[PDB]
Design a protein around this ligand. Structure first.
Ligand code: HEC
Ligand code: HEC
Ligand code: HEC
Ligand code: HEC
Ligand code: HEC
Ligand code: HEC
Ligand code: HEC
Ligand code: HEC
Ligand code: HEC
Ligand code: HEC
Ligand code: HEC
Ligand code: HEC
Ligand code: HEC
Ligand code: HEC
Lengths: 89, 89, 89, 89, 89, 89, 89, 89, 89, 89, 89, 89, 89, 89, 89
């Protein structure tokens, strides 16, 4: 449910710009472990947390989802992202 | 207006899951003084504040209303909740 | 997520006949602990399981959701029902 | 009620492919005693049971109704089929 | 027809979560021989059967298709999956 | 599958004008052996083939399905028609 | 683009209450340098930042745009406000 | 096209009350040769014409289609009715 | 039903220009016995018929209802008009 | 209240066909003392009762209000009708 | 009009449970002469009246239409039912 | 079924004004044995009948359900009321 | 009628904020004798009048109904409130 | 303007119940000098004032217009009523 | 909230004729301090009160809002008007 629900959240909220784990706005900032490690702050420490944080506050071109998603929904989707990034989309 | 307006805010934004001060998602986390005291962080110190904080940031299954409601609207509704919880819905 | 997601499942699939935990078809077979204990087979052994089983296979007027819901969705909703029945809808 | 309710179940779930007791998909596998005896496994032993079993698990082009119908609904409709087949549709 | 029809069934019912033989929900449980062998029960004994069984009953986040698909449709799609997995999607 | 799948094809593509094996456009050109024998070219020689040919090229008011259906789908449905016509719809 | 895009953001999100740089809700809290200096916290230190902060978190009657706008969009619009306030709307 | 187009006209304009050639309003006034002969004026002289005339002017509960249908459309549908009535719907 | 149904027909189709039995288009051509007698052809022979005829064919500014209303509907409404005109609207 | 409330009842339920105390369906059966005396059964004996009875059971084209209105509402409106009829609408 | 209007009444009020003259609630209590004779009280004496009476008072699962329909409307629809049942829907 | 079905009838038709056996319109005329005995005519002879009679004809502010409910539905609900009143709601 | 009509007025105009005699806006100012006595001016002298006065002029967050309701409607509803408050909602 | 504007006010606000100077609710309380003298308090002393007062405060079934109309509007319409009553509507 | 809520009230109820603080009906009677001082009675003593009073009772062409707005809503909007008039709309 954690990861499995994150999938739902993802298609409904993230797939627009992160189809297939890519990045339709800023090309080189994708959701691949490689990039996630390179550009996400604190990704090596706590992957999920790092992602979750980003999702919550947004960044540059990327809006945050603080009001839109429940904390749970955010954990779930971050968890999904990490899990998907580990296998390679 | 403080409490009286909070009522408007409440029906329009909270009644969906907190009809009658209950909790349609997580049964045991209702808006009764009893529960509010038990589960809300800092409720005995500053009731309103505590509530307001929750509303602002959300929690688990409950989304936050940071972007959706104005700070005022949040104070107002929290104030309502407390007032209503004190008399017992 | 377990219980919290069950809530979603419930409104989308059960509220039609069990809005408020009642029973719009067969009056006396509601989702109150009292009734659940009285009429559900094995409720006193494993509440969730008992419920889940019912949901999966249906019973009399009540259709089963075997094909419609994923096992996970069924666990989740059953979990919700129990949790909600414990506090009293 | 047994047979009488099976009738309801039948129109709502079986008449699509078995209107008039025929077989719109596989011509020669109808619901006539003659055919039922010829192709249904164990029809001579326990007619109802045999039918019920088929309904529950499906077979080849025919889907099963395990999750969709309650066990009772299945008994009921099988009972109907047998009764109707005895009389000749 | 066996495999060829399974293809139809697949796009219509499975491609949503298994496009390209991947797994959009649970990353590491894909439809590659490698994974199918690793996680599917009895895959080495009877590939098709194993798959068919899964499809029929569902598993965890994956719903079953017992009522939705005819036994035949299930054989067909399982047959497709195996054939496609052998070649590598 | 041959005949059984033709059934699917039939409802999805032919039942509009041939529900019950009749002919809603040109009354007397139905799908009964009697008529099929009377009006279809080469029906006596190779029933299926004859039908299949018609389906592929269409005729007068009846459109052909050359591009719409795969050769297989056409064989299948023709096979169905013949089988159904032999038993009498 | 910084300032130029902020203009777009502004009409689409702020002009409703800050038409012409005024304040339709709270009269005396406008977007004129004079007022901005008087009431905005830290305006003399970093104008843009100060504004941006306000926009992000909202204040009293004014909602925040944390979830609605991307950080960039917020920088852009704040930049616009300052630039416009410097010349005098 | 005469008869074949009449079919289109028929479903679009007559099937509402004459589906299957019956009469949903006045039971015994159907479109069967038997009835058509019995109740339609001049049916044994010029079938089509008789029908066409009815369609044009309407009769009792049945509205006429003078303004709605083109003369051709009327000929066409009348022709269809006769042809269909001759074979027996 | 004759007169009583005519009432329905009347509001739905005639009241637009003949509310209260007046004539919103051509002032002096109302539905009062006085006028009806004066301007309607054959009103003193067969009131209903006269009216009915008008309704069917229309006249000058007034459209006819030949295709729109069934002959019965026309009889009914004409009957209503006469009955209402006799008492005086 | 008796008569005064009947007024409310009247506009809400009777004015549709009896606005101004007339009769839009059956012209000559109005609510004038003259007519009421002529056509209502027992009007001379107990005016109110007579009316009330009609209202309760309906008559020909006029539906009854047995289930729709409470006995009280019926008394009230009948009382109104009589009072209004006495003064002449 | 009698029968013809009953048709309107029927679709608007009865077709929901008696479309095609069947019985969607209680299978075996249809509107066929056969059944009507078997289960309706006094059907052999005065068909219409018998039906009308049922319609007026309802019976078991079937609600009555006393307040909803005018006596007239009830006569009309009963008349329709009988007429339709005589021919055979 | 008698009492058990009356429960269904009750929520669907009576709970609006008699939730919990109270009386939302006329305070002191509730459904408690105490009151029922005090105000219902003949309650002390045949409880059910007394109630049933009331339900059928209504009384003052309370509408009757003669046309709306079938006699069985009325018996059933009256039976429920009595049973519930004996037990104290 | 006095009290009984007040009930109608109440649901239509007061139940929005006083459902069940509570106070959805200002928690502690309910319609219980206890509170009514505590906060309503002159409640001990003339209950109805006191209430009626409030309803007419409104008070704080509660609007008055001077123009909306007739004096009568106001008496009626006040009378209801008192009667209901005496019994305890 | 005094009287002339009162006319506007009257059609817009009073004609609903006092068309033609009658009284659609309470028959015998019309706006004729005769009645006005008979039932209006102080009509003989200051006609206008008397009327105006009534309009302002309402009476029994008649609502007051205190908040709805400006004092002038009230003077104006009262003036109209008197003037019209003197002349006999 | 006082002023801030008045803003809401204003757009919803006053902007129609006082958009931008102007006066669409009577040109020279605007909501500018200048005019407010000139034409509003007692504006120099208690601005808010003066305004509030006007709003409550209306004046000439301007309707009053006595019944429509709660006293609180009236205070709020008056407060807004004054505040807005002080800075200059
Ligand atoms: C489109 C408008 C976006 C939506 C919807 C979401 N994201 Fe996004 N995301 C977007 C951009 C342009 C960027 C790069 C911003 C920058 O300057 O760094 C991002 C970045 C991410 C990242 C990090 C990727 C990396 O740095 O390599 C994550 C983890 C991320 N986005 C997650 C994410 C999720 C899960 C979303 C749904 C809730 C989501 N994004 C939506 C643009 C957009
Ligand atoms: C439904 C989707 C929700 C909406 C809308 C709001 N709340 Fe909620 N709230 C919800 C849940 C599931 C929970 C429990 C979450 C947890 O794990 O703790 C809450 C909790 C609260 C609480 C605290 C109750 C307690 O802990 O006993 C408060 C004070 C609260 N919610 C307030 C509140 C208000 C005022 C809302 C409207 C703006 C609101 N909630 C909406 C779910 C949802
Ligand atoms: C309406 C058509 C139904 C839907 C949708 C669901 N349920 Fe139901 N449920 C229904 C009936 C008529 C009955 C009684 C059947 C009988 O003869 O026993 C039930 C019963 C239950 C129960 C047990 C209640 C009890 O016995 O006291 C449970 C636990 C239950 N239903 C759960 C449930 C859930 C969670 C559903 C959604 C997935 C659901 N039901 C749907 C009718 C209907
Ligand atoms: C259409 C898609 C079907 C529905 C709906 C149901 N049945 Fe069916 N049924 C169908 C087929 C194609 C077949 C033959 C499959 C084969 O290869 O054997 C069947 C067979 C039966 C039979 C046995 C008939 C015989 O073998 O002579 C029974 C008893 C039967 N079906 C019952 C039945 C009932 C009661 C259904 C409703 C719940 C039902 N079928 C639905 C196709 C379809
Ligand atoms: C999305 C909601 C799903 C649909 C539609 C289908 N499948 Fe799926 N499938 C899904 C998940 C999340 C999983 C993993 C569940 C687990 O915990 O094991 C699966 C798994 C499979 C597998 C096995 C893959 C493996 O274990 O390596 C098979 C063979 C499979 N799914 C087949 C399949 C087919 C053919 C479907 C269409 C009828 C189908 N799935 C739909 C999620 C979903
Ligand atoms: C409606 C627009 C049609 C659709 C869809 C299909 N058919 Fe049809 N078919 C139609 C007509 C008007 C006719 C007669 C044309 C003529 O002038 O001969 C036909 C005829 C057939 C026949 C032969 C029947 C006979 O001659 O007795 C066959 C075998 C036939 N049609 C098959 C068929 C199938 C299987 C279709 C689905 C793929 C199909 N038709 C569709 C009109 C229409
Ligand atoms: C209307 C509902 C608002 C929208 C949309 C936005 N703002 Fe606003 N803003 C509003 C109010 C009522 C106030 C005053 C709140 C208080 O009590 O201080 C503000 C204030 C500002 C300010 C500061 C002005 C000052 O203090 O002098 C800024 C810089 C500001 N608002 C910016 C701003 C921008 C850029 C917006 C769009 C994204 C925006 N506001 C929207 C009310 C509302
Ligand atoms: C429903 C409102 C109707 C529509 C649409 C059409 N018809 Fe009809 N038709 C209807 C009725 C009630 C009757 C009987 C009227 C009477 O009192 O005689 C009819 C009759 C016919 C007939 C003659 C049947 C017979 O007398 O046995 C024909 C030939 C007929 N209708 C043709 C027809 C056609 C082709 C239509 C479409 C253009 C059509 N009807 C529409 C009611 C209705
Ligand atoms: C408005 C566009 C009309 C509708 C709708 C209907 N009628 Fe009419 N009607 C209209 C006009 C302008 C006239 C006068 C035309 C002329 O030059 O004579 C009429 C006339 C009648 C009459 C006769 C009145 C008289 O001559 O004194 C009748 C009997 C009549 N109209 C009936 C009638 C009915 C029943 C209608 C509904 C089906 C209907 N009219 C509609 C304009 C319009
Ligand atoms: C329209 C569909 C009607 C509604 C609404 C009501 N009434 Fe009616 N009423 C109507 C008709 C067609 C008739 C005549 C029926 C007949 O054949 O006798 C009536 C008659 C009355 C009468 C008697 C008038 C008389 O016979 O002179 C009364 C007293 C009456 N109607 C009262 C009445 C009231 C008070 C209604 C509201 C609750 C009401 N009617 C509604 C048609 C319709
Ligand atoms: C669905 C909720 C119904 C509506 C709408 C109407 N009827 Fe019905 N009807 C219904 C049922 C469940 C039954 C059987 C009740 C029993 O226990 O006997 C009936 C029965 C009839 C019958 C008699 C059929 C028979 O006994 O064989 C008639 C004549 C009948 N219904 C008529 C009828 C009409 C004309 C309606 C419209 C006004 C109508 N019914 C509506 C359920 C429902
Ligand atoms: C609300 C509009 C009502 C509905 C729905 C039903 N009842 Fe009622 N009931 C209502 C009132 C106002 C009264 C009192 C009327 C009077 O002046 O006596 C009643 C009374 C009863 C009673 C008797 C209670 C007593 O006298 O102590 C019974 C037994 C009763 N009502 C039963 C009942 C049932 C079973 C209903 C559903 C079918 C029902 N009522 C509906 C108002 C209303
Ligand atoms: C309908 C709901 C009403 C509206 C609108 C207005 N009036 Fe009325 N008015 C009405 C009633 C029921 C009564 C009688 C009340 C009673 O018990 O006395 C009245 C009375 C008057 C009168 C006095 C008539 C008389 O006593 O003979 C006057 C002068 C009067 N009404 C004036 C009046 C005006 C001018 C209105 C518009 C602003 C107005 N009424 C509206 C019912 C209704
Ligand atoms: C339009 C139909 C109006 C609405 C809506 C409101 N007002 Fe108005 N207002 C209107 C007019 C024509 C006038 C002048 C009347 C006169 O003869 O004096 C007014 C006046 C005011 C004023 C005083 C302005 C001045 O005298 O300079 C105020 C303070 C005022 N209006 C306030 C106001 C408010 C706050 C409203 C909303 C609740 C409101 N008006 C609505 C016309 C209309």
């Amino acid at each position: 449910g954690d990861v499995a629900a994150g999938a739902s959240v993802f298609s409904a909220n993230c797939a627009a710009c992160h189809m297939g784990g890519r990045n339709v706005i800023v090309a080189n900032k994708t959701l691949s472990k490689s990039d996630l490690a390179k550009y996400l702050k604190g990704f090596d420490d706590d992957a999920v947390a790092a992602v979750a944080y980003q999702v919550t506050n947004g960044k540059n071109a990327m809006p945050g989802f603080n009001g839109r998603l429940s904390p749970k929904q955010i954990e779930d989707v971050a968890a999904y992202v990490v899990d998907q990034a580990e296998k390679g989309w």
